[PDB]
Design a protein around this ligand. Sequence first.
Ligand SMILES: C[C@H](CCC(=O)NCCC[N+](C)(C)CCCS(=O)(=O)[O-])[C@H]1CC[C@H]2[C@@H]3[C@H](O)C[C@@H]4C[C@H](O)CC[C@]4(C)[C@H]3C[C@H](O)[C@]12C
Ligand SMILES: C[C@H](CCC(=O)NCCC[N+](C)(C)CCCS(=O)(=O)[O-])[C@H]1CC[C@H]2[C@@H]3[C@H](O)C[C@@H]4C[C@H](O)CC[C@]4(C)[C@H]3C[C@H](O)[C@]12C
Ligand SMILES: Nc1ncnc2c1ncn2[C@@H]1O[C@H](CSCC[C@H](N)C(=O)O)[C@@H](O)[C@H]1O
Ligand code: SF4
Ligand code: FES
Ligand SMILES: [C-]#N
Ligand SMILES: [Fe+2]
Ligand SMILES: [S]
Ligand SMILES: [S]
Length: 347
Amino acid sequence: MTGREILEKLERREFTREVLKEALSINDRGFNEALFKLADEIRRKYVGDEVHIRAIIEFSNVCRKNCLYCGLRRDNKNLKRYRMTPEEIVERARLAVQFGAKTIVLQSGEDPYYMPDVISDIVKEIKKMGVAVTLSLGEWPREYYEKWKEAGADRYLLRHETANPVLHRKLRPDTSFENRLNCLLTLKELGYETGAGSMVGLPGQTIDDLVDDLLFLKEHDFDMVGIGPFIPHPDTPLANEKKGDFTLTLKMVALTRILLPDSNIPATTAMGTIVPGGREITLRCGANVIMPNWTPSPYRQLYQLYPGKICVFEKDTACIPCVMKMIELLGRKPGRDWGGRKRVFET
Ligand SMILES: C[C@H](CCC(=O)NCCC[N+](C)(C)CCCS(=O)(=O)[O-])[C@H]1CC[C@H]2[C@@H]3[C@H](O)C[C@@H]4C[C@H](O)CC[C@]4(C)[C@H]3C[C@H](O)[C@]12C
Ligand SMILES: C[C@H](CCC(=O)NCCC[N+](C)(C)CCCS(=O)(=O)[O-])[C@H]1CC[C@H]2[C@@H]3[C@H](O)C[C@@H]4C[C@H](O)CC[C@]4(C)[C@H]3C[C@H](O)[C@]12C
Ligand SMILES: Nc1ncnc2c1ncn2[C@@H]1O[C@H](CSCC[C@H](N)C(=O)O)[C@@H](O)[C@H]1O
Ligand code: SF4
Ligand code: FES
Ligand SMILES: [C-]#N
Ligand SMILES: [Fe+2]
Ligand SMILES: [S]
Ligand SMILES: [S]
């Protein structure tokens, strides 16, 4: 179809596989800009001008899994491993709340040391501060997810990475897409606000795979969707592969907003790493959430999912003020509440 015809169908919410594939296959600048403008408008209409700040504390880089893309994979001996103590984590979260953070995100490698009871105790302490808590700890038994929900966790970010089961198993040899999806369904059933999302430009991933990622996100109606480019890490088996394309990833963000108009969608760290100013662009093409790095030195530099990760060289209180300045210069507004999903029921 022509680009104009594709945009017309997107505006009429006729989200067929062919429409999504054509949107991802057209590279015309005029089409792309019109797609970004549509997503920006849908974002404004459904979720408004507030940009929600989620302060991330990457509290351990120990991991039991061996994902082929990830710098924290267990086979990487070229990385100093660290673990923050529970007291350090709680006090670091307290500092973020003192700086105005309304959500605390705890993210780590799949580090067994904390699971499940240390996490539960940390969550209970942070919840006393009157903020939302999001966990991003990987794949664990239902019993652990249950304990963390009873302890007060509000949300769970478990990006699905890729909806292609063959590619998923090759890149994540300890597990499977089937288990990842089961974890996501369990999280939803337990009442978490649940986040999924994929990487764009993985080795062997096709445009059809990206369409499947979009249809997967639409099918399950996730509360949050985290999308970013694949960034090769020199100490992994994918060191020599090509990085994901920023524009194609941006189109995935924009189409996700169009498909899931009331969802929460971050402008990911990876988007800011791949292109200078990438997060600001993404906030203008469908995203409405930003997640400043709140990991303290000397650990911030060691959470090396991929190289070149932004904000490693800044003072460790720098990122919350920085994103507040970013939101203001974008003409946007601070989030006033926890920024939970506000469902607009449609037809
Ligand atoms: C800032 C630059 C180009 C600068 C420019 O060229 N214009 C700025 C003011 C100049 N004026 C036209 C007002 C004066 C003309 C008189 S003059 O004689 O000086 O030319 C423009 C050109 C293309 C624009 C992006 C695309 O749309 C896609 C997307 C749409 C979303 O919704 C918002 C985000 C995003 C990324 C846009 C952001 C921004 O907006 C861009 C980069
Ligand atoms: C942590 C220390 C010491 C005092 C303290 O421990 N303060 C707790 C505040 C708790 N809250 C944020 C929930 C209050 C919000 C009240 S508010 O009126 O904003 O709704 C206080 C003293 C001055 C405060 C900064 C400045 O102000 C400027 C700026 C305002 C933004 O906005 C938030 C970010 C920033 C950088 C502030 C961060 C932080 O806060 C500072 C460093
Ligand atoms: N090389 C790379 N490039 C871009 N993103 C990467 C990456 N390696 C890992 N990531 C992203 O980092 C995210 C958090 S990894 C930490 C949380 C948890 N261990 C988990 O796997 O869910 C992953 O979901 C993945 O999408
Ligand atoms: S993506 Fe998550 S589970 Fe996989 S190696 Fe990295 S930290 Fe471990
Ligand atoms: S958000 Fe980290 S220094 Fe700007
Ligand atoms: C992630 N931001
Ligand atoms: Fe993230
Ligand atoms: S930062
Ligand atoms: S920033």
